[PDB]
């Protein structure tokens, strides 16, 4: 098994973004969310209410807390550190060289495959047009290194089997990750750009984007 990627304090968020978090429709998030260095005007659709400390906000849509760069200390500093830790984790995940990888598997199409724990690397994008299964134990790790986009097709699932846990799966994606309508994704998405959830998509994991995260009637949870 690979060693788990260190998310640092970005591991305290189920959605972390640099340029925005937007929602429409019947969304349900469990966990904390935040943006930095942008202000909370970049968090749209959530009907935010500040705590009296102004260190966080709450939303009916979020079982947890909402943070932004323009909140009261120590939130700005904490958010800058979470974003730095995300950027550090992205670069580390992209840089893992042991165990030695499986490279260009399926020419990027992992549909129908069962993948053991390991490091998987592509020069292409990755597409999941039929279910993929990640099969392994409670503490087994997967690290996916994707030089282009990641796409989960409508209605498709990233299945976990054998004790595999979403928390121990890491998707490093240089292009956009797009989760199709009514899809179900497992793992942490370290995106250089955007993470997009189309209508009804479910993410079990974390959406850690260096641009934006968009939700459409989506469920996001790390628990």
Pairing between β-strand 49-50 and β-strand 15-17 as defined by DSSP bridges: unpaired
Is residue 3 assigned to a domain?
Answer: no
- The answer to whether 118 and 98 are in contact (CB under 8 A) is no
Residue 90: CB atoms within 10 A of its CB come to 23
Q: Resolution, in Å, please? A: 1.5
- In the chain, the number of structural domains is 1
Cα–Cα distance between 27 and 20 in angstroms, integer? 16
In degrees rounded to 5, what are phi and psi of residue 167? -60, -20
Is residue 15 assigned to a domain?
Answer: yes
CA nearest to 28, candidates 222, 217, 223: 217
- The answer to whether 53 and 10 are in contact (CB under 8 A) is no
Pairing between β-strand 184-191 and β-strand 169-173 as defined by DSSP bridges: parallel
Cα–Cα distance between 175 and 155 in angstroms, integer? 22
Question: Dihedral (C-alpha) 111, 116, 121, 125: value to the nearest 10 degrees?
Answer: 20
Is residue 1 assigned to a domain?
Answer: no
CA nearest to 75, candidates 35, 25, 117: 35
Residues 6+ apart with CB under 8 A from 85: 6, 7, 8, 9, 10, 11
Where in the sequence is the domain holding 91, given as residue range(s)? 8-221
In terms of DSSP H, where are the helices of the chain?
75-95
Is residue 158 assigned to a domain?
Answer: yes
Is residue 148 assigned to a domain?
Answer: yes
Is residue 27 assigned to a domain?
Answer: yes
Question: Obtained via which technique?
Answer: X-ray
Residue 33: CB atoms within 10 A of its CB come to 27
- The answer to whether 151 and 128 are in contact (CB under 8 A) is yes
Tell me the β-bridge partners of 144.
120, 171
The first and second tokens of residue 161, run together, are: 């089997």
Which strands, in side-by-side order, build the sheet including 20-24? 43-44, 20-24, 212-216, 195-197, 177-179, 150-152, 126-128
Q: Which conformational region is residue 187 in: left (phi greater than 0), alpha (psi within -120 to 50 degrees), or beta?
A: left
Handedness of CA 44, 68, 201, 122 (dihedral sign): positive
């Amino acid at each position: 098994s690979p060693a788990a990627v260190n998310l640092g304090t970005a591991g305290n968020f189920v959605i972390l973004a640099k340029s925005g978090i937007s929602t429409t429709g019947t969304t349900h998030v469990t966990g904390d969310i935040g943006v930095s260095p942008i202000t909370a005007t970049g968090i749209t659709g959530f009907g935010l209410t500040m705590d009296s400390s102004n260190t966080f906000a709450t939303s009916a849509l979020v079982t947890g807390k909402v943070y932004a760069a323009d909140y009261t200390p120590p939130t700005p500093a904490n958010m800058s550190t979470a974003v730095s830790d995300m950027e550090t984790a992205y670069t580390a995940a992209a840089g893992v060289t042991a165990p030695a990888p499986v490279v260009e598997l399926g020419a990027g199409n992992i549909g129908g495959m069962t993948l053991a724990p390991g490091v998987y690397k592509w020069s292409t994008g990755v597409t999941i047009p039929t279910d993929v299964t990640l099969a392994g134990g409670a503490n087994d790790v997967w690290i996916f290194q994707i030089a282009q986009t990641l796409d989960l097709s409508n209605g498709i699932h990233v299945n976990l089997s054998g004790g595999a846990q979403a928390a121990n799966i890491f998707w490093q994606v240089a292009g956009q990750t797009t989760l199709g309508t009514t899809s179900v994704f497992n793992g942490n998405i370290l995106d250089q750009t955007a993470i997009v959830l189309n209508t009804g998509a479910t993410l079990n994991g974390r959406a850690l984007a260096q641009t934006a995260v968009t939700l459409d009637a989506s469920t996001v949870s790390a628990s």
